Amino acid sequence: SSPGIWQLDCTHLEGKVILVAVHVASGYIEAEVIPAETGQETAYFLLKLAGRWPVKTVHTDNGSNFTSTTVKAACWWAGIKQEDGIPYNPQSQGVIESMNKELKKIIGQVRDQAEHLKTAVQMAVFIHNHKRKGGGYSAGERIVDIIATDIQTK
Amino acid sequence: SSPGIWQLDCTHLEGKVILVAVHVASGYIEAEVIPAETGQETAYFLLKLAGRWPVKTVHTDNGSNFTSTTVKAACWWAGIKQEDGIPYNPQSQGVIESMNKELKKIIGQVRDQAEHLKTAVQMAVFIHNHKRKGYSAGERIVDIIATDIQ
């Protein structure tokens, strides 16, 4: 849970594909609906994330994106260390499962509001990142605190 | 500028449209290529920005987006105060002009690398936010908002 470490997570809703990056130390996320989880989609998503936050390491969500030359090229371009996402600490899988369930619940709670899934996913990213836990600091507050504490030391 | 204030900027390249949000105090940006600058696209862009960073106020880039009920609805949903983008300080026009020129120069420098403009714009966002000016814009926005939290 160093300041630069993120995890990719791909979840499905009604067969549409939601790709999520979770900053491990804070639980802050960014997410997008994508047409299918291809190398090309994941690479582009990682390029966006790393221009916006200081992404040092990413634990990839599966072996296809770990292997993908397109994902490796974007990781090289953006100075990201690509790593596997094997849950050596088994509590990792349950934390990700619980986030996906939370995200899907919020999506459901905004269905009277968003015509397209992509809006509902961004409403969910907003409510996730601003939720005070359960501190009570939010994930958005913690990621900024963590990275700023890192700049002032290293 | 206060830690929550952002400015929208829309620039064109090839007749494709690039929409940029600039965090005024730091110069950090996020940007997207969009098919045309509609209320719906601007609104969606603001909803994404405000889920990622604490967006208190946005200076909108033109009167159409200031007026748009779709943009006002996103601003209401995301708790953003919508403001005009009138350069009461005329040096603002120039700072945004220069950033657009710098963004387009980076886009040009990555032509041998990105097949699609959308990739080039995100490589430009990356190089802009990491460039040491010596802190980078990315460092400054985190510093600014963290000072505000504490």
Ligand SMILES: c1ccc(-c2nsc(N3CCCNCC3)n2)cc1
């Ligand atoms: C995503 C990323 C960062 C944030 C975020 N940073 S500071 C902050 N707060 C500032 C102090 C209380 N006022 C509003 C909350 N919130 C929120 C979502």
Ligand SMILES: c1ccc(-c2nsc(N3CCCNCC3)n2)cc1
């Ligand atoms: C977008 C948003 C934030 C950043 C960002 N924050 S801290 C950081 N570091 C840059 C160099 C490595 N360690 C010193 C601090 N860089 C970069 C781009």
Ligand SMILES: [Cl-]
């Ligand atoms: Cl693929």
Ligand SMILES: [Cl-]
């Ligand atoms: Cl793509």
Ligand SMILES: [Cl-]
């Ligand atoms: Cl290949």
Ligand SMILES: [Cl-]
């Ligand atoms: Cl849209």
